[PDB]
């Protein structure tokens, strides 16, 4: 039950984080394609946004380990 | 049952928080691409919107922990 | 059952709240990118809309805590 | 089964009400962007539509409370 | 089972009624935005349409109460 | 089992009836917006199509009552 | 088991019939809007098409009652 | 199990057949609006396609009745 | 288990078959509408494709009957 | 367990196969509509693609029978 | 359990393999239609891509068999 | 439980790997069609992306085997 | 439950990572096709984005092995 729990928590967090980053990274690739001169502005948005999007997935991962220990 | 509960809360919280942020960050990246001159305005919307979107997912994380402890 | 229940309520409230805020903030970012003069106008709608969209999710959070305590 | 029932009613009602509101608010933001002279008219539609959309979710919340108490 | 049933009936009715109302209201807002002269005509379609969409969700709320009591 | 059954039939009937009506009403709001001279004509199709779409959801509500009583 | 079965059969039949009708009535409303002189023509296609789409859902409703009785 | 099986078979057959016919009728309505001259030609394709689409659902309904009786 | 099995095989076969045919017929209708002079040619693709698409659903139907009997 | 297994393998194989073929056939019909001179070319792509798309669904059918027998 | 296991690996691998191939082949057909001069190069892409898409679906099929045997 | 596990690992790995490869191969085909001068550029992108996308599904396949042995 | 747990974590991790990488690689390909000069800029974004998006999926894989061993 602890195993199932930890797995569901880890599993959903993986999906959460991976898709979220992918959406953001795509956005900056498309924007950069549209406006090469905004490369740096766009990249900084990516670097701010990724951590924000991974925050709760990371927490859920931690909880996943707490369930396992 | 406590493990499963906590996993579900954290897992769904992860999905909610991560995707929400991505939608918002993407919108911001796109907007800034269309209108570089609006950078700051759009970044303010991001910084306001992100916390607002995280609020309930964060509360569900607190509940996930209350279930575990 | 109480743990499982508390989780289902909080988890679903997280999704509901996070996604609804994303949709509203994204529309606000988009409206503003399109018509920068309506920046304040669109901001006011975001500030009215968000509490409205969070209302039921927040009540579900309370019910979650009630199920738990 | 009461906890599970309460949660299910409350969580679904939260998804229902939050997303319904997001859709209505997003329409209002899009409409006001295109036709700013109509902001009042549209805001009235939003203030009518929102309560209408929240009606069954709230009754489900009330049912969630009856299941608990 | 009475609790689980009542909650399933009420949860689904809320999803049904709220989303359906949102869709209709959105349409009315988009329509009124394109053709402001039609605002009353469109509003009458909303007021006729909303009760029709809510009809069966309301019946299912009654059934939810009949199962609960 | 009766309770669970009645709720599944009522809840699915609600989703069915509410969404279909919404689809049909949206379409008549959009059409009326594009071709206001067709107001009456389109309203007639709405009034024909709504009962038709509600037919089977209503039989299922009846079956829902038969399971409860 | 009979109750569950009757509910599943009737609930799936309601979704089926209601959505199918909705798709056809919508197509009819859109078509009529684009070509008002084909009102009768298209209305005939609706009246042929609806019974065809409703056919199996109605059989499933018969099976629902056979299961209930 | 027989009841639940007959129900799954008939309910899936209803979803399959109603949606399938709706897709085909819609195409026929859209085609006729686009190129009204082909009314009869498209109607023939509809009359050929509807029975073909309905074939496996109807067999599944028969299997439903075999499971029941 | 036999009953449940036969119903899953048959119901899934029905959805596969009916929707596959609809997609192909829809395409043939759209094709014919755009290029009336290819009527015969597009029809022949339809008569080749339906049997091909229906091939595995039909086997699934045989397996459903093997399970029953 | 063997009946439920055989039904799952077969019913999934049916959805896999039917839908894959429908997607390929539709693409052939659309291509032939747009470029009638490529008829034979596109038809050969269809005849290579369909067996390939069905290879795994077909193996899943064999495995389904191995489970029954 | 062995049976149910083999069925899930096989049906999943069937869905994965068929749909992937359908997407790749549809791409080849659409591209060949737009730029027939690239028939050979697009066909090489497809003959490289299809096996790569099938790699893990085929391994999963091997596992399904180890589970059975 | 082992069989079931192994099957969930391998079937999800199959879906994951297959669809991902299809998305990438499709993108390669569509781009080469728009810009045949870049067929080698695009193909190098494809040969880099594919192994990356398969990394985790391949590992997950290893795990599936560990579970089974 | 350890087996089932490890499989859920590894399988969800595979879907997460595969799709995220694919979305990103697709974006890179589309951008490179639209703007061949940015080839290297876009490729760097891809080499930053991929490791990022696979981070949490990799942690879930690690967790999958913990659960197993
Ligand atoms: C458990 C299932 C996991 C996978 C669920 C689906 C994964 C894919 C999610 C991403 C889908 C949406 O993409 P996107 O980049 O926002 O497109 C934006 C397109 N524009 C450029 C026009 C804005
Ligand atoms: C349980 C697993 C759940 C997986 C959830 C995955 C959901 C991903 C949804 C992301 C897609 C939405 O993207 P977005 O930025 O709103 O743009 C959409 C509108 N435009 C393209 C025009 C901008
Ligand atoms: C476990 C289940 C998780 C569910 C996750 C579902 C994610 C849904 C995300 C929805 C994102 C899209 O929103 P939106 O901007 O209103 O549409 C865009 C419309 N425009 C084309 C006008 C821009
Ligand atoms: C279990 C949790 C489920 C969460 C599901 C969330 C889904 C939210 C999707 C809502 C999408 C709302 O976009 P829409 O009204 O089509 O925009 C159309 C705007 N234009 C008319 C300008 C194009
Ligand atoms: C259990 C979770 C349930 C969540 C379900 C969410 C469903 C939301 C679907 C409704 C999305 C919008 O649709 P609509 O406004 O009719 O069309 C869009 C209008 N245009 C055609 C002009 C773009
Ligand atoms: C239990 C959860 C059930 C949720 C079910 C929600 C279903 C909502 C989808 C129905 C709204 C769709 O609107 P529509 O008029 O077809 O526009 C679609 C956009 N076009 C007109 C361009 C096609
Ligand atoms: C549990 C069941 C939940 C209910 C599921 C709801 C499904 C709703 C799907 C209904 C979608 C409406 O399609 P349609 O109007 O034929 O397309 C119109 C396309 N054009 C307007 C661009 C031509
Ligand atoms: C349990 C779920 C039951 C409800 C499922 C609803 C499925 C709706 C399927 C789609 C219904 C209508 O789209 P369609 O006729 O394919 O044309 C769309 C493409 N065109 C715009 C070119 C015409
Ligand atoms: C009951 C549970 C299972 C229900 C499954 C129902 C699924 C029905 C979905 C049928 C949709 C098929 O649309 P179509 O004609 O290929 O057009 C698609 C054209 N575009 C891709 C360009 C939009
Ligand atoms: C039990 C589960 C059953 C699920 C059944 C779902 C079936 C839905 C399949 C729908 C596939 C539709 O794709 P398509 O028409 O090839 O794309 C058309 C795109 N263009 C027109 C732009 C080329
Ligand atoms: C449980 C089993 C359910 C299986 C249901 C699988 C349904 C898969 C349907 C997937 C069809 C996707 O088509 P596609 O190639 O992306 O075309 C998109 C056309 N354009 C790129 C031009 C826009
Ligand atoms: C059991 C679950 C089975 C799920 C099967 C999922 C089907 C695969 C996903 C659907 C196909 C996604 O096509 P894509 O090339 O990414 O976007 C479209 C490319 N354009 C930019 C041209 C629009
Ligand atoms: C077991 C269930 C597994 C389901 C996995 C299904 C995954 C489907 C992934 C398909 C997502 C494709 O999004 P994307 O590449 O951003 O297209 C964006 C194209 N535009 C920019 C034109 C919008
Ligand atoms: Na973008
Ligand atoms: Na945007
Ligand atoms: Na918007
Ligand atoms: Na509208
Ligand atoms: Na319409
Ligand atoms: Na239409
Ligand atoms: Na059509
Ligand atoms: Na077509
Ligand atoms: Na592409
Ligand atoms: Na892109």
């Amino acid at each position: 039950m602890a195993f199932l729990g930890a797995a569901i928590a880890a599993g959903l967090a993986a999906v959460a984080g991976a898709i979220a980053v992918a959406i953001i990274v795509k956005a900056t690739i498309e924007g950069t394609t549209r406006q090469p001169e905004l490369r740096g502005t766009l990249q900084t948005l990516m670097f701010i946004g990724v951590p924000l999007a991974e925050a709760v997935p990371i927490i859920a991962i931690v909880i996943s380990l707490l369930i396992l220990f």
Side-chain angles (χ1 to χ4, degrees), chain A:
Chain A
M1 227 45 194
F3 293 133
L4 236 168
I8 284 158
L12 294 181
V15 171
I19 301 314
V21 168
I23 293 177
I24 296 173
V25 170
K26 181 195 184 199
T28 121
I29 286 175
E30 292 192 15
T32 295
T33 291
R34 269 57 150 183
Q35 306 285 129
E37 59 292 354
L38 302 183
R39 190 234 199 110
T41 302
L42 298 193
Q43 204 185 64
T44 289
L45 287 175
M46 182 185 64
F47 284 142
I48 290 174
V50 167
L52 291 180
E54 297 274 44
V56 183
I58 291 306
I59 300 170
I61 283 284
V62 165
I63 283 178
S64 170
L65 287 167
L66 297 174
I67 296 174
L68 257 196
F69 309 101

